Each structure stands twice: as structure tokens, then as C-alpha cells.
Write a protein that binds this ligand. Structure first.
Ligand code: HEM
Ligand code: HEM
Lengths: 219, 219
């Protein structure tokens, strides 16, 4: 991932936070020269084993995902293949009108974590079930409404033969936190102020992240 | 793009619409077997000279983008290479507690357009400057606050040698509009109703899309 130094994650935990808050990744592997790469949007969770052995920069951590086994990308997920998982968080277009500075150019503030690693296909029926149930339980607790899977565990087992589950061992993770760090403090405050007053949560989230980046040229 | 039949764009114009509102694409090309694919977030516009604005049918359309020429992906972007541009729109986790049905599994409603095409590198500095000026002007009208670049056109010339601009001639465009179409009408209404009341606009945006649609995912 190409990241100018002033847009790198302010601390490694920001990557963890973004991955956990936006776990529907784009999973990308090389394809043929004529087809281009494969890409599938699919849910990713940290492997619960990694919680007790957490690496600061996520290197060597294990993530889990699944996809449809009818999806052509599944046939290509050979164990040992390199994979990219791209997670995106809040973002918003920045009008130069908020800068109060001339000259200037517009830009887009945005947040992204690119994780690279090696795929291992999961074939076991029980381990596949462990993946989808841990994904269901983690997402429901974080984003849901106290739904109880207990009456649907047998339902999961009925449909689990269709699941293509896989593990990613992380070889690198990098954050792009493009939040006006190139601008003077007075200029970032003006954008952040304008973004807070929008009321559209995505703008508010972007403003909150820009406020937590310490004082550190793009465009 | 792998898309179950019931999640495909109901009309080609939905894809243009999504790209229009979320033009910061993830631009992806193949890499080496050891590196994995290249991926860069960058802004995409229709070529004003040809396509001009967004058409229902994107096949054969000409798009333009740019990235930093110092970005390793620029070196690998040979003219004639295939590229993927992935655009994402609104999305939201769906708790089964909204279904009122047992058993069930959770899911994530989301929207995505994958555009594939053939790359042509732009080398003229004036044409490169044309690309970024058209991008800034288009985005400012759509997302900004009436900022006038006139006093910054000389600033653009100063920094434009760093711009790697490129054209994509589109060979295919496919939409993933995952909006609970696998669920019965009463269930879709109930999820959509809940998304309207959340107050996070991303949820409202997802609800508005579910309302526009008149199947065995997780079934
Ligand atoms: C909890 C959050 C979950 C999310 C967000 C989620 C999301 C998804 C997505 C987006 C796909 C399509 C992948 C592709 O395009 O290749 C998929 C596939 C699939 N998932 Fe999940 N899933 C979740 C949990 C579960 C659970 C608990 C099960 C139970 C076994 C399950 C079973 C399946 C199956 C069978 C498929 C492939 C066939 C189909 O789409 O029905 N998933 N999932
Ligand atoms: C709304 C309008 C624009 C947006 C959203 C935008 C966005 C971006 C992004 C995301 C990158 C990073 C690409 C990478 O990671 O490799 C970039 C690079 C660049 N953009 Fe633009 N751009 C816009 C307009 C312009 C204009 C008008 C110019 C004037 C020349 C310009 C000059 C550059 C340059 C020189 C770079 C490479 C070096 C750097 O990032 O500072 N951009 N732009």
C-alpha cells in the first residue's frame, strides 16, 4: 500500500478499530492477465485465538472470512496464495472553500486499511461452522440488537455445506488515514467544524477522526 | 463479479448512480505472485470529451482517474492492461431480530459496482491537467460549496507533473445491490423501517435503496 508518511495510521490500534468497525472487506487476489484480479465483498473477523496473542501491527495475526463456494474466486483460493483485504471507514469530500486559503486544491478525506497475508482454505464442516458462528456472534453483539442464535444453530448446520471458509495469516497491514494532516492546524479545525455540523454521520465520524490526529505536502 | 441473480442491479442506471455518488474507487490490477494485486483509492470521472456524464450502460464508456506517479502501482499500469475499479455505496448490518422469523442467520446489506476495462496511460501534461481540473470541478459542484479554482490554476500546473492520469475504456460493469431481496416483503419492510429510524444516514441511505426494489442467500 502506498501511503504518504503523514497519512499513516497514528497508532496501530487505529487499524484494529477500523477493521472491527467496518468488517465487510473487499478480498482481492490476482487473476489472469486478461480477467484482472478477483474481488469479493465478504465479512472478516479476527480469529478469536489472536485476541490472546495480539500483535501491535497485526503482523502474523489470523483473520477468518467466508464466501459462497459457487463464487469463482473460491476455486482460486489455493492455500498459500497471497490475498489482499481492503477495509474502508469514514470518508468525505473536502471543498477548498473550507480552507480559507488560496491557492488550494480539493481532496477527499478517507480511511482505509489494507491487510496482506496468505490464504488457508478451511474445509472441515465443524471448523467452517466455528467461522460463521463466530462471525454471526461478533457482528450481532457489535452492530445488532441482542438476537439469540441458539434456535438457529441447527439452521446454520443445514446451510454450512455452502460456506467457503478461509483463514488469512497476516504478512503486513497498513492504514491510510487521510484526514488533512497536510494542512495547518487552523485549516483542519475549519474542515472539522464544517464536518461536525453536517449531521450526516459519515461526515461527523470523519471529523472525529481528524480531531484525534496529533499535529504532524499532498496537493 | 459474482452476484446472485436477485442482487443484480435492477437497471443499469443504478450503477451509474452509485459511481456518481461514491466516485472514490478502489483501482486494482494484478501484481506478482509474491506481492499480490495492487490497490489504490483514487477518484474516477467520465471522460468529458466522450461519455461526459454517467450513462445507464457503461459498456464502452471512457472513464478517467489519477494517482501519484511515485505510487508503485503507476509503474505497473501499462497501457493496454486490464484494471478493476470497485465503487461501494451504502451498507448496513442486518440483525435477525428484525426478521421476526426463526430460524435465521444475520447478513450485511451492501452496494457495490465493479467496473473492468482497459487502461491507457495519459502522458501529456496538458491532458493530465485537463483530467484533474475536470475531476475537481465535477466533484466541487456535486459535493462542495461553490469554490472557484481560478486563482489556483497556476497552483495546479506547479504540482501536476506528479499526477499519473489514466483513461479506462470499460469492458464490463456489474452491480451488487444486496438489499434483503431474498426475504419476504413484510420482512424487507421491517428491516427498511428500522433502517429509516436509526439516525445514521448510511442506514437511511440503505433503507432508501431497499424501498426501490418491488432466492436462497442464507436460506
Ligand atoms: C453474521 C454475519 C454474516 C455476514 C455479514 C455474511 C455475509 C455473507 C456474504 C456477503 C456472502 C456472499 C459471499 C460471496 O459473494 O462469495 C456470504 C455467503 C454465505 N454465507 Fe454468510 N454471512 C454471515 C454469517 C453466516 C452464517 C451464520 C451462516 C450459517 C451457515 C452463513 C452461511 C453462508 C452461506 C451458505 C453462503 C454462500 C451461499 C449463500 O450466499 O447463501 N453466513 N455470507
Ligand atoms: C476532487 C478532486 C481531487 C481528488 C478527490 C484527488 C484525489 C487524489 C488522491 C486520492 C490521490 C492519491 C493517489 C495515490 O494514492 O497514489 C491524489 C494524488 C495526487 N493528486 Fe489529486 N485529487 C483531486 C484533484 C487534483 C487536482 C486538481 C490536482 C492538481 C494538479 C491534483 C494533484 C494531485 C497530485 C500531484 C497527486 C500526487 C502527489 C500527491 O498526492 O500530492 N489532484 N489525488
Amino acid at each position: 500500500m502506498f501511503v504518504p508518511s503523514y497519512y499513516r495510521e497514528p497508532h496501530g490500534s487505529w487499524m484494529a478499530e477500523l477493521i472491527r468497525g467496518n468488517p465487510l472487506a473487499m478480498a482481492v487476489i490476482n487473476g489472469s492477465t486478461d480477467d484482472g484480479p478477483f474481488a469479493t465483498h465478504l465479512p472478516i473477523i479476527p480469529d478469536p485465538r489472536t485476541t490472546g496473542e495480539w500483535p501491535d501491527d497485526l503482523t502474523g495475526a489470523n483473520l477468518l472470512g467466508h464466501m459462497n463456494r459457487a463464487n469463482p474466486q473460491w476455486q482460486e483460493l489455493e492455500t498459500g496464495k497471497v490475498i489482499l483485504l481492503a477495509f474502508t471507514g469514514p470518508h468525505a469530500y473536502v471543498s477548498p472553500a473550507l480552507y480559507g486559503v488560496t491557492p488550494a486544491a480539493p481532496t477527499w478525506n478517507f480511511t482505509s486499511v489494507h491487510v496482506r497475508g496468505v490464504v488457508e482454505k478451511i474445509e472441515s464442516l465443524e471448523e467452517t461452522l466455528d467461522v460463521v458462528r463466530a462471525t454471526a456472534g461478533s457482528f450481532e453483539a457489535r452492530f445488532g440488537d441482542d438476537w439469540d442464535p441458539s434456535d438457529s444453530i441447527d439452521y446454520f448446520r443445514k446451510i454450512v455445506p455452502g460456506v467457503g471458509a478461509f483463514r488469512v495469516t497476516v504478512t503486513s497491514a497498513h492504514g491510510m488515514f487521510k484526514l488533512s494532516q497536510e494542512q495547518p492546524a487552523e485549516v483542519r479545525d475549519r474542515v472539522q467544524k464544517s464536518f461536525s455540523g453536517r449531521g450526516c454521520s459519515r461526515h461527523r465520524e470523519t471529523a472525529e477522526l481528524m480531531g484525534r490526529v496529533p499535529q504532524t505536502h499532498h496537493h
